[PDB]
Design an enzyme around this catalytic site. Structure first.
Site, PDB file in Angstrom:
ATOM      1  CG  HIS A  64      -1.883  -1.177   1.170  1.00 47.30           C
ATOM      2  ND1 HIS A  64      -2.916  -1.364   0.253  1.00 47.30           N
ATOM      3  CD2 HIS A  64      -1.943  -2.256   1.944  1.00 47.30           C
ATOM      4  CE1 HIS A  64      -3.552  -2.493   0.523  1.00 47.30           C
ATOM      5  NE2 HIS A  64      -2.917  -3.056   1.567  1.00 47.30           N
ATOM      6  CG  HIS A  89       3.020   5.586   5.843  1.00 48.86           C
ATOM      7  ND1 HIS A  89       2.699   5.513   7.166  1.00 48.86           N
ATOM      8  CD2 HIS A  89       2.023   6.333   5.265  1.00 48.86           C
ATOM      9  CE1 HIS A  89       1.557   6.143   7.376  1.00 48.86           C
ATOM     10  NE2 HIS A  89       1.127   6.680   6.228  1.00 48.86           N
ATOM     11  CG  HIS A  91      -0.219   8.725   1.789  1.00 45.46           C
ATOM     12  ND1 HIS A  91      -1.093   7.651   1.776  1.00 45.46           N
ATOM     13  CD2 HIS A  91       0.117   8.905   3.096  1.00 45.46           C
ATOM     14  CE1 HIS A  91      -1.223   7.197   3.008  1.00 45.46           C
ATOM     15  NE2 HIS A  91      -0.515   7.939   3.867  1.00 45.46           N
ATOM     16  CD  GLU A 102      -3.447   9.902   2.742  1.00 45.38           C
ATOM     17  OE1 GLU A 102      -3.119   9.690   3.923  1.00 45.38           O
ATOM     18  OE2 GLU A 102      -4.277   9.210   2.100  1.00 45.38           O
ATOM     19  CG  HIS A 115       1.043  10.445   6.928  1.00 42.61           C
ATOM     20  ND1 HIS A 115       0.001   9.824   6.230  1.00 42.61           N
ATOM     21  CD2 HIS A 115       0.847  11.782   6.818  1.00 42.61           C
ATOM     22  CE1 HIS A 115      -0.762  10.764   5.752  1.00 42.61           C
ATOM     23  NE2 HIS A 115      -0.281  11.994   6.093  1.00 42.61           N
ATOM     24  CB  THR A 196      -5.672   8.379   5.465  1.00 43.31           C
ATOM     25  OG1 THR A 196      -4.383   7.777   5.243  1.00 43.31           O
ATOM     26  CG2 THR A 196      -5.565   9.642   6.291  1.00 43.31           C
TER      27      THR A 196
HETATM   28  C1  LIG Z   1       0.137   3.286   4.449  1.00 43.68           C
HETATM   29  O1  LIG Z   1      -0.848   2.713   5.351  1.00 43.68           O
HETATM   30  C2  LIG Z   1      -0.886   3.262   6.619  1.00 43.68           C
HETATM   31  C3  LIG Z   1      -1.487   4.513   6.777  1.00 43.68           C
HETATM   32  F1  LIG Z   1      -1.845   5.171   5.665  1.00 43.68           F
HETATM   33  C4  LIG Z   1      -1.550   5.127   8.024  1.00 43.68           C
HETATM   34  S1  LIG Z   1      -2.037   6.859   8.257  1.00 43.68           S
HETATM   35  N1  LIG Z   1      -2.065   7.554   6.865  1.00 43.68           N
HETATM   36  O2  LIG Z   1      -0.966   7.385   9.046  1.00 43.68           O
HETATM   37  O3  LIG Z   1      -3.348   6.797   8.834  1.00 43.68           O
HETATM   38  C5  LIG Z   1      -1.123   4.349   9.098  1.00 43.68           C
HETATM   39  F2  LIG Z   1      -1.194   4.946  10.331  1.00 43.68           F
HETATM   40  C6  LIG Z   1      -0.578   3.109   9.039  1.00 43.68           C
HETATM   41  N2  LIG Z   1      -0.053   2.466  10.178  1.00 43.68           N
HETATM   42  C7  LIG Z   1      -0.608   2.466  11.491  1.00 43.68           C
HETATM   43  C8  LIG Z   1       0.430   1.794  12.413  1.00 43.68           C
HETATM   44  C9  LIG Z   1       0.159   1.777  13.822  1.00 43.68           C
HETATM   45  C10 LIG Z   1      -1.092   1.052  14.336  1.00 43.68           C
HETATM   46  C11 LIG Z   1      -1.380  -0.333  13.711  1.00 43.68           C
HETATM   47  C12 LIG Z   1      -2.488  -0.236  12.640  1.00 43.68           C
HETATM   48  C13 LIG Z   1      -2.186   0.459  11.246  1.00 43.68           C
HETATM   49  C14 LIG Z   1      -1.906   1.862  11.360  1.00 43.68           C
HETATM   50  C15 LIG Z   1      -0.440   2.551   7.721  1.00 43.68           C
HETATM   51  S2  LIG Z   1       0.261   0.983   7.366  1.00 43.68           S
HETATM   52  O4  LIG Z   1       1.346   1.193   6.448  1.00 43.68           O
HETATM   53  O5  LIG Z   1       0.640   0.341   8.618  1.00 43.68           O
HETATM   54  C16 LIG Z   1      -0.944  -0.020   6.611  1.00 43.68           C
HETATM   55  C17 LIG Z   1      -2.163  -0.209   7.535  1.00 43.68           C
HETATM   56  C18 LIG Z   1      -3.196  -1.103   6.870  1.00 43.68           C
HETATM   57  O6  LIG Z   1      -4.218  -1.239   7.806  1.00 43.68           O
HETATM   58 ZN   LIG Z   2      -0.437   7.904   5.876  1.00 46.20          ZN
END
Ligand SMILES: COc1c(F)c(S(N)(=O)=O)c(F)c(NC2CCCCCCC2)c1S(=O)(=O)CCCO
Ligand SMILES: [Zn+2]
Ligand SMILES: COc1c(F)c(S(N)(=O)=O)c(F)c(NC2CCCCCCC2)c1S(=O)(=O)CCCO
Ligand SMILES: [Zn+2]
Lengths: 261, 260
Positions: A64, A89, A91, A102, A115, A196
């Site tokens: 993702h 990570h 976007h 975003e 983020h 998100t």
């Molecule tokens: C790129 O995906 C995201 C993401 F977009 C976001 S955002 N934009 O910060 O809300 C994330 F926070 C996370 N990570 C969090 C990690 C801490 C808690 C455990 C649950 C997943 C949330 C992630 S992830 O790469 O881990 C994939 C999660 C798929 O459910």
């Molecule tokens: Zn994010």
């Protein structure tokens, strides 16, 4: 199997992930009508962000985004609890449309967004436990503009051809993560929102810094062309592009600013 | 379905699968996706001057306020004749009075008027046309704040009589072309969808380039006059923010009738 395009894209996430159709969703458009200055929004302190260059940190393509794992001795303070980093990570958009932030500001997308995800380590033993609790997570967001080459972001992007496919991992030497932050970090937007991505839990305290950083067109092009959402051996490859959610209705929220003008 | 809470737009695709499908509207109309197309000649608005001796039904359907229109009213200039069926509006709320559906360069207008038509050459009625190829054509007028607009008041003066869902009022005919902006030859055109359930991807959109004006008091009336609940609902809900968020729109173009 959720995606950003086609029958598993964002208008369909709520079919499998009910919170994606719930309240307090992110991201949002930051615009004057919903901004309000809050003088209590004092500066955050960034503790243990200067990661040793002699250590190494895991970079993963999770299908993702590309994420970098962060150690729990890295924290932000200034919140009513201390929050420990867990990962960062990005976007982004695509080569022909490098407009994949975003959050938007006055209706405009930035080129990309970083983020830095933290969890409340005073209260919870790991981010997965925190993720479904109120104010369990705190995410810092940096808006990214096309501009000058950024050597600090390149400490991540220089590894992209080694995590091209879902599930692949690489190591990145430590560097000072505060180099990824923009000028005047005391100036930020703060609001209550959500992940998100699925499962869209409404458990995030968002801090979006006022000022963007710059990375070059060439760095954006690498980010936009290096990565796939699919495994190395998948016969139906999918490019990892346009991995941003559309902005969400406000649901009566305001966004609080640490700056008054 | 609603515009908030559990039955809001991110959940429409549960019951209405096309809301998660292709060609969804509305979209942001922005420079990098615009392309002049000389084939986009002016539309002609025929039978828009509705007899003052007839009356037209205004309804609150719990989603917007709609005015029924007669099928003798039509657009000329498309390959098929598209006959009118109804008009309605979308708006925001007094704390954030920027509730158009389409955006221009990322910016919402205060409100937006839609005049819905169906392909009456191919189909017998709008309902039948709505899920079919070349079925629908919608004209969109962007609305901003400015001087008082007597023509929009021919609708808005009736709003109190349709305060609650299910209520109706009769509006005497007037010239619907008075609701259109200056220089209707200048427009954006693209293939998209209904912006509400069932979200069928069967709409040819024409968004006029230039907005109209209504007064601050007119816009406040639109934003505050209506409820999305029946009169006897013990939990009333104001009808506000009745617009869909913009949709992703990649690898396409919006065509413009104007180049300059
Ligand atoms: C790129 O995906 C995201 C993401 F977009 C976001 S955002 N934009 O910060 O809300 C994330 F926070 C996370 N990570 C969090 C990690 C801490 C808690 C455990 C649950 C997943 C949330 C992630 S992830 O790469 O881990 C994939 C999660 C798929 O459910
Ligand atoms: Zn994010
Ligand atoms: C305000 O709701 C809208 C609406 F937003 C739109 S939009 N924006 O023009 O796509 C509509 F077209 C309609 N009407 C069309 C009438 C012709 C075909 C029959 C199916 C309904 C589409 C309506 S409606 O008031 O009738 C509610 C329809 C719920 O299905
Ligand atoms: Zn409409």
């Amino acid at each position: 199997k959720w995606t950003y395009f086609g029958p598993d894209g964002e208008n369909s996430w709520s079919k499998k992930y009910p919170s994606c159709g719930g309240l307090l969703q992110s991201p949002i458009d930051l615009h004057s009508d919903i901004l309000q200055y809050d003088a209590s929004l004092t500066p955050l302190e960034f503790q243990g962000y200067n990661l040793s260059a002699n250590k190494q940190f895991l970079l993963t393509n999770n299908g993702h985004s590309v994420k970098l794992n962060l150690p729990s001795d890295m924290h932000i303070q200034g919140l009513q609890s201390r929050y420990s980093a867990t990962q960062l990570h990005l976007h982004w958009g695509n080569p022909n449309d490098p407009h994949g932030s975003e959050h938007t500001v006055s209706g405009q997308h930035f080129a990309a967004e970083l983020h830095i995800v933290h969890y409340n380590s005073d209260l919870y033993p790991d981010a997965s436990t925190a993720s479904n609790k109120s104010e369990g997570l705190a995410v810092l967001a940096v808006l990214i503009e096309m501009g000058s080459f950024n050597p600090s972001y390149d400490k991540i992007f220089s590894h992209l051809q080694h995590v091209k496919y879902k599930g692949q991992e690489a190591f990145v030497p430590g560097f000072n993560i505060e180099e990824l932050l923009p000028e005047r970090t005391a100036e930020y937007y703060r609001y209550r929102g959500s992940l998100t991505t699925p499962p869209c839990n409404p458990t995030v305290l968002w801090t979006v810094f006022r000022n963007p950083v710059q990375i070059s067109q060439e760095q954006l092009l690498a980010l936009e062309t290096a990565l796939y959402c699919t495994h190395m051996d998948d016969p139906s490859p999918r490019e990892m592009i346009n991995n941003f959610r559309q902005v969400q209705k406000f649901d009566e929220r305001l966004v609080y600013t640490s700056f008054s003008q």
